Structure 1
Amino acid sequence: TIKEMPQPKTFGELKNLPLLNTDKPVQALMKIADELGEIFKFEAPGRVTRYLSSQRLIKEACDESRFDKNLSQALKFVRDFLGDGLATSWTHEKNWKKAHNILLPSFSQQAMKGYHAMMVDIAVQLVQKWERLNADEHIEVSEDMTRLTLDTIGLCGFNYRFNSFYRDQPHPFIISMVRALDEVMNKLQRANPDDPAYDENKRQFQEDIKVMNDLVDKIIADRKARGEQSDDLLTQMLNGKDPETGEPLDDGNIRYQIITFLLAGHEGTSGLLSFALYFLVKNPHVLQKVAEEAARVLVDPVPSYKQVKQLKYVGMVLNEALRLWPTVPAFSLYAKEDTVLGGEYPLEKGDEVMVLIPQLHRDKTVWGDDVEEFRPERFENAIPQHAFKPFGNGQRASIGQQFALHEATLVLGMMLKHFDFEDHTNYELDIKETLSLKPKGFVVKAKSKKIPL
């Protein structure tokens, strides 16, 4: 039956916008969803979207005959620096399908055998850093996972070394990228984002975009100077031809892809690794089970590709981390035609819906009563269509899913092979939002098991 859609408190002409005047908007949206249920409208000046939280509705949103990817307001702002790169292009834009076809083979399960050695290079640097800490020191978890994930995509993708583990001050590229993302988040909170009152933030934003483009220049210059032949992402982009069209990407689009991969390659995965260790230190029995599997499987000084694929319980741990805290916590869709959602909510062509992934992942009708518990065994055996969506949906799902999960499986495996962890501060979870999610202030101490590399 057609029903009126729930909607939270409005503030005159500002509509719902003041509800998200917070540094933790996705967490605030989860609270609204707790209060209003599976669907609610959220208006701000000049835009409307509808936040979905149940598998019953999200399964319909994920029907590609009915909905296509939408550029949320956040993506539209991110597009100021990512352009028509893969993540910020419309499905119908020429460069989407073109770049997709050119790059997809670079991200398959098979391409992972190729990247494995270089993933190991950076994982070893992480393990060595932690082996070299003195007794009175600790680990800043999200910070070190970011060093690893950035360096891994730099190296695997572009044969470029960020050398993040040689730095205690974060890489200039990351300083600017984080500030650009912070600006996007602040811009989402403005009534009139084009107001010339914000021309200063715009100045800084453009300076940070220049910094990102300066790094792209260095990556391209290094490629030309090192004068080696590689089959990495950049090589595929410079020479690869779209089999559908028979054209290569233009330099402008390649530049956008480089920045896209550096961002995306690192943000999601670093949060996943940090959430996973967090859950392990809070769920000691699960830790023991991971440690047992690492010790049992990782019998060589460094992991092989085949050994990583045998870390089945580590993979379950990672999926359960993604269930509770999917690190790219939403994605947006638009109605391809006039339709009715859920037998209940009429939509007009172009109307936007937002999939609130953390809420979908707490839907008791799919998962059972215990959704707040960290229980990797969930994945042991058979879950429903579109209940678990940490990598988005359909042909606009993450191109990085296998890359991210191979890396994180490798790294978490090595971490638990080589160390025991202590939650020395009895850390209370604090989730930082930079569009993506990651723990803030999560610290531990590691006690080496003294197993050489």
Structure 2
Amino acid sequence: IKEMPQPKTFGELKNLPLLNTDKPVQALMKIADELGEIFKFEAPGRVTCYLSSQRLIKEACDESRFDKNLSQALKFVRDFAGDGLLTSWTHEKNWKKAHNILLPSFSQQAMKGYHAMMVDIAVQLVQKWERLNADEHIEVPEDMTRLTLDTIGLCGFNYRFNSFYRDQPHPFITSMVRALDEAMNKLQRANPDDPAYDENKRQFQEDIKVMNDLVDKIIADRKASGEQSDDLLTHMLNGKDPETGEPLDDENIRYQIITFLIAGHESTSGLLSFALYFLVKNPHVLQKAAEEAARVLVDPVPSYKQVKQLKYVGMVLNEALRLWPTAPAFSLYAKEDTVLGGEYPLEKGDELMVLIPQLHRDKTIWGDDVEEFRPERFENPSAIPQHAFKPFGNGQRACIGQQFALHEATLVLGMMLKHFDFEDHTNYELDIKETLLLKPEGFVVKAKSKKIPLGG
């Protein structure tokens, strides 16, 4: 039984002066390098505990002792994501019900049905880049976000945002992105009911009606035609919880649709952008990956089977997730009084954060060279110690989109590698912007086409 390690406290400010940054996760990582696998963090009126070692994180992942907590971010996101799967407590009736209904629609098998729609958008991306003039360049996260949003839109509810036809995004995306940005901004707002934020709260209400109006209209449209589809909306309209026997109601269906867009777009865009960041910085890995892509992707458009044979591209994406998991933290609470790691007593309801980028640099698990980009670490996934690699969270509250995200990213990165050579023409210095997610801000490349025809 030990006192919990903790950074210096500064009077009433507690540990807050140590996070005077718009990159708190990276600052927290530096604090963990100093204090080790657990420290307590205090701010005026809040206390949390940050875990970074596999040894402790494997205890935190025992679901009989700790359940998912809604961070303050998730709470503010709940004002428009409602009781969709991401922003619900595990005890909510609609959590268990939407989970049981939705899980078969997110399985590896189910990816066979979304494949044609993911290729549709992936071809539009390849075509965009094929059509650039020499001397133009690519804005990487901006184009990955066009792709992921359009793919979730199409696979999710057969709606085309048509992001590659636009300078200014579709109104629904604008409202969604501004809603998220407002929810993030609220976290560091000292005088929230001040008059200066009345414009903020009106705009926030406008963006919610825009999102709701569109999604309610498409749901009602679909119920009136009876059209069936290869989309998640179809499954939610037809599905019944095997446990209660009930279906989702229209309002919850709307929240799940908004939730897929929130949960899937930025996180999957980051994963593709970081993977392409590490490849252009490690030309020898880029060549090995491009060699796989040429060997495997023999038809003008990839089959589902082919995507599954892209094992090295898969390793690349897992190593990008090791170094910079794009959702860098998830929050947990103690369900009852407990002792963590035989040393730290926790009281019922105490909060823990899992600092995933630090977890992923546990030298006792990964070897001393943790900063190096080595996809080969993932050659044999079953040999990786249990709970060492957690970019998709944990247990029943893990990412339901994991197979969808991975299949999407493998497909797209395999086609990028097949069709283009890449140049890091600005010698880009990694700049990791933090919102709810990580992304390599300002990352730009040039792509030189290999002149390989696409398909019907």
Kept in 2, the 8 Å contact 1:14–1:191? The answer is no
Alignment of 1:40-439 (within 5 A): 40-190=39-189, 198-220=197-219, 222-223=221-222, 228-381=227-380, 382-439=383-440
Secondary structure of the equivalent of 2:47?
Answer: strand
Shift in CA distance, 80/36, structure 1 to aligned 2, threshold 3 Å:
same
Per-residue CA deviation, residues 247-269 of structure 1 (Å, 9 max, x unaligned), is 11122212211110111121111
TM-score of the aligned structures, taking structure 2 as reference length: 0.95
- C-alpha separation in 2, matches of 1:228 and 1:168: 32
Alignment coverage as a number of residue pairs = 452
Per-residue CA deviation, residues 430-452 of structure 1 (Å, 9 max, x unaligned), is 11111111111000000000000
1:278 is displaced (CA, Å) by 0.4
Per-residue CA deviation, residues 122-158 of structure 1 (Å, 9 max, x unaligned), is 0000000000000010000001000010010100111
Mark the runs of 5 or more structure 1 residues left unpaired by the alignment.
none
Shift in CA distance, 452/441, structure 1 to aligned 2, threshold 3 Å:
same
- C-alpha separation in 2, matches of 1:334 and 1:240: 31
1:3 is displaced (CA, Å) by 1.7
Q: CA RMSD in A?
A: 1.7
Secondary structure of the equivalent of 1:110?
Answer: coil
Percent sequence identity is: 96
Kept in 2, the 8 Å contact 1:44–1:191? The answer is no
Mark the runs of 5 or more structure 2 residues left unpaired by the alignment.
none
1:227 is displaced (CA, Å) by 5.5
Per-residue CA deviation, residues 369-405 of structure 1 (Å, 9 max, x unaligned), is 1110000000112111101000000011000000000
Kept in 1, the 8 Å contact 2:113–2:230? The answer is no
Larger displacement relative to structure 2 (206-215 or 421-430): 206-215
Shift in CA distance, 183/42, structure 1 to aligned 2, threshold 3 Å:
farther
1:174 is displaced (CA, Å) by 2.7
Larger displacement relative to structure 2 (70-79 or 52-61): 70-79
- C-alpha separation in 2, matches of 1:439 and 1:229: 39
Larger displacement relative to structure 2 (236-245 or 118-127): 236-245
Secondary structure of the equivalent of 1:68?
Answer: strand
Shift in CA distance, 260/18, structure 1 to aligned 2, threshold 3 Å:
farther
Kept in 2, the 8 Å contact 1:425–1:443? The answer is yes
Per-residue CA deviation, residues 78-109 of structure 1 (Å, 9 max, x unaligned), is 11111111011111110111000111111001
- C-alpha separation in 2, matches of 1:326 and 1:253: 29
Shift in CA distance, 194/51, structure 1 to aligned 2, threshold 3 Å:
farther
Kept in 1, the 8 Å contact 2:114–2:230? The answer is no
- C-alpha separation in 1, matches of 2:329 and 2:228: 38
Shift in CA distance, 194/56, structure 1 to aligned 2, threshold 3 Å:
farther
Larger displacement relative to structure 2 (114-123 or 223-232): 223-232
Shift in CA distance, 316/242, structure 1 to aligned 2, threshold 3 Å:
same
Shift in CA distance, 444/257, structure 1 to aligned 2, threshold 3 Å:
same
Shift in CA distance, 198/13, structure 1 to aligned 2, threshold 3 Å:
farther
Shift in CA distance, 177/36, structure 1 to aligned 2, threshold 3 Å:
farther
- C-alpha separation in 1, matches of 2:3 and 2:199: 41
Shift in CA distance, 215/35, structure 1 to aligned 2, threshold 3 Å:
farther
Kept in 2, the 8 Å contact 1:272–1:318? The answer is yes
1:193 is displaced (CA, Å) by 5.2
Per-residue CA deviation, residues 170-208 of structure 1 (Å, 9 max, x unaligned), is 333232222222222222223565677744433332222
Kept in 2, the 8 Å contact 1:334–1:351? The answer is yes
Kept in 1, the 8 Å contact 2:155–2:230? The answer is no
TM-score of the aligned structures, taking structure 1 as reference length: 0.96
Shift in CA distance, 262/16, structure 1 to aligned 2, threshold 3 Å:
same
Per-residue CA deviation, residues 276-324 of structure 1 (Å, 9 max, x unaligned), is 0000000000000000000000000000000000000000000000000
- C-alpha separation in 2, matches of 1:399 and 1:60: 22
- C-alpha separation in 2, matches of 1:44 and 1:117: 49
Secondary structure of the equivalent of 1:200?
Answer: helix
- C-alpha separation in 2, matches of 1:81 and 1:17: 29
Larger displacement relative to structure 2 (14-23 or 338-347): 14-23
Secondary structure of the equivalent of 1:249?
Answer: coil
